[PDB]
Ligand binder design. Structure first.
Ligand SMILES: [Ru+3]
Ligand SMILES: [Ru+3]
Ligand SMILES: [Ru+3]
Ligand SMILES: [Ru+3]
Ligand SMILES: [Ru+3]
Ligand SMILES: [Ru+3]
Ligand SMILES: [Ru+3]
Ligand SMILES: [Ru+3]
Ligand SMILES: [Ru+3]
Ligand SMILES: [Ru+3]
Ligand SMILES: [Ru+3]
Ligand SMILES: [Ru+3]
Ligand SMILES: [Ru+3]
Ligand SMILES: [Ru+3]
Ligand SMILES: [Ru+3]
Ligand SMILES: [Ru+3]
Ligand SMILES: [Ru+3]
Ligand SMILES: [Ru+3]
Ligand SMILES: [Ru+3]
Ligand SMILES: [Ru+3]
Ligand SMILES: [Ru+3]
Ligand SMILES: [Ru+3]
Ligand SMILES: [Ru+3]
Ligand SMILES: [Ru+3]
Lengths: 173, 173, 173, 173, 173, 173
């Protein structure tokens, strides 16, 4: 087929489609996190908003990947989105630990795709990742680490008070 | 458990969760439609944007349902999102026919949920659907029917020309 | 000689000069295309303007390459610019096909230069191409593919009407 | 052919095409001059900008000629553009002397074309040249003569100092 | 330890710390240059300001490297800053020659770090350098070469006059 | 030498150079403190900013001293800057204690220099210190004492919570 496709391997095309799925899955996980913290029996508004905003960011990442797939002459292929790994997400610390784990997996997927692009001598792909994804992900993971540290400092032996304060004073809504 | 839940049946709670899944599935279908019409070998910008905007609307419908689930003291439960029914969506007519089919199924789900709420004497639910979903869906289905009619009129024996004109003159981007 | 040159191979320097020539040749081709579509017996104003704007963009690409050649301490060397491959460019479809061919050749030259820079461990060059040329070229080729598709859809068995409509409704002046 | 052509000789048509080539060649020469004076080992910013601006003006002259060729129903025909006569342009004095030589040749070409138009009783052509080219060229040649005089006065036996001062105090960037 | 560190080698971490030291050392050298040209018996205000502004830029480079070191989960380690290589910096030409030497050493350190990152498959690092350091350094070295050329042209056999003029007419304060 | 120097002893000149070194060393210490509190495993943004701002203030103190050294006809002489006394700075209390110690040493150096100036009957120096340094330092040491007191009050037996609160409610970023 393609009238525009140039220097775009089938391997990169398929890996782009898989990364789309991983970003949409991450978005869905964040949607679940966001609504869990909005429960009347959890009620941590700032935490909810933090995860809700991440759901939006990850959907935007997927949409940028899809746009690029079309710009390169590849074909978007969608698969099922697996529901999130938990139905209830525990404390803010549990949730932030789960978020960092999820982000490290996305980062590793970005790094794996970058390596594939280098192997395939696909500099456009390499640039696209560098310019829209790699630093954004490093910044986000740093912010989550900063949060985890502050959450952990606040646990002590008065965990409720610390969880309230973090939400009130770090994650202002 | 719940400290707030009142007049909120387990049957409605589960049906709300199922409707969330149907809205998110519809959003995903529209995301696929949107990107298909952005392909270099399809290239109907107005069609793409129409479906992309619908993806956003259906995600917003899901988020309103999730918000209400929490307001009522129910518990959001997420399931897999099944990938869309096609990988390639054919002509604008094929796509708009598929969209109307999808919307009629969502509408029927709304009507089924409303009937459950009436059976359960849950007026809050009934009002919520009436006020945010039932008329929005009737308006959308009317707009899709209007489109289908105009698309069909334009086919004739010069289908390419008609498809271009519809996109240019009805769905301005 | 150079008091500033550092990590800048003679091979990259010469390839930069050759790419300048290819960009200026592309500019010249577009100048010819632009004036052909302004002929009284062709008279497709939007087509003319599309190619005229491309002539300007390709000259700007050449000037950025020349600026960089001086920033690196290389020496600009100019060669003849070969006149464009045709004197008359046929239909809008013929012209857009010729434009995509030309752009794919420029893209391949960019990719070849990038590969040379990688081989020579010249990251400044690699970055320069990634940042000002590779994505610009992918975007342009995608836009030309989108056009070609719409042009092709409009041919049918009423080619004049389709050519007029494309110019009027896609390439507004 | 032409449905519009009137009082437009084949001789004038061909001479217009040749003048286009001479203007584009002059533009190219100025592009080379502009980049030479931007070299780290030349570094005369004002000189560079003077020639860069002339490159633009000469391209604009060519484009006006091409527009007129189409207005008259003639057919643009492009030939190769011969690379500029030097790769390195010497001092500002050498360059300005080369520029005046180039401009006198363009002027003589304008005058020769005007004479052809008079011989062919083509007043539109005569007016076009008078109104957009002849006085512009006389003004430019006067400005170059004024520069040459000031450059020459500044040589004396401190040539570097004089070259710096001219660039700083006459050709402010 | 680190809860965020991912794909960040100990080799890159240590080299980042060494580059910080090189940037801070360069800042210190520029601070010394700046104050030397502010001496009553040197009194070249524009030269002073040029070097003072470079001191600030190099400190900012160090601070960006330190910020990135923390974003990646590395640990900043500081060492002594060696005092600048001279106490008195000679003429503006001597100083600008010393500045270009210093900058070429920084550039080579950037290029060496980039090569390490490529060897370690660390694209974030590679991108960080490309995006904030490599082109900034090429631009700065080009500007210093342009200055050196103008300074050299002005020496002749009236060195005082040329030094005054360069400061007055190129480096306006 | 000096054409301007008047009433400026070699003893004061050398002591000014030593104080410059002490201010630059203090700046460097604060740079290290600032980045330590920006670590993902420390993550006290307000603390970081407090020390980062002090790094800037101490560099400015050094630059004022250097400016004055030139105004008086003295000669700036730079020495090595010894790296900061620690690589890791402990808690906010540890850091603020270290900061007060550092500031008391700077203050004592100011007082020692003032005494030298009085001994040398150098009223300009005395005024310069009084007007730009002595009260600034007293104000800063008072602010650090106020902080130390609040930090100490917050330790109690819930040290993490107190450290978070101080950063959030006293050192707002
Ligand atoms: Ru809220
Ligand atoms: Ru890469
Ligand atoms: Ru982009
Ligand atoms: Ru809120
Ligand atoms: Ru569009
Ligand atoms: Ru009802
Ligand atoms: Ru409502
Ligand atoms: Ru559009
Ligand atoms: Ru027009
Ligand atoms: Ru590369
Ligand atoms: Ru750039
Ligand atoms: Ru027009
Ligand atoms: Ru310039
Ligand atoms: Ru005449
Ligand atoms: Ru006119
Ligand atoms: Ru300039
Ligand atoms: Ru000054
Ligand atoms: Ru690289
Ligand atoms: Ru950045
Ligand atoms: Ru000044
Ligand atoms: Ru901060
Ligand atoms: Ru006193
Ligand atoms: Ru003062
Ligand atoms: Ru902050």
């Amino acid at each position: 087929s393609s009238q525009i496709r140039q220097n775009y391997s089938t391997e990169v095309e398929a890996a782009v489609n898989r990364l789309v799925n991983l970003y949409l899955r991450a978005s869905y996980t964040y949607l679940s996190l966001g609504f869990y913290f909005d429960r009347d029996d959890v009620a941590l508004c700032g935490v909810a908003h933090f995860f809700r905003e991440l759901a939006e960011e990850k959907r935007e990442g997927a949409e940028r990947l899809l746009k690029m797939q079309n710009q390169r002459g590849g074909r978007a292929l969608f698969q099922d989105l697996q529901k999130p790994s938990q139905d209830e997400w525990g404390t803010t610390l549990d949730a932030m630990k789960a978020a960092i784990v999820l982000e490290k997996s996305l980062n590793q997927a970005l790094l794996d795709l970058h390596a594939l692009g280098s192997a395939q001598a696909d500099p456009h792909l390499c640039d696209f990742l560098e310019s829209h994804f790699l630093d954004e992900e490093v910044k986000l993971i740093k912010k989550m680490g900063d949060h985890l540290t502050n959450i952990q400092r606040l646990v002590g032996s008065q965990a409720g008070l610390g969880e309230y304060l973090f939400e009130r004073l770090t994650l202002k809504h």
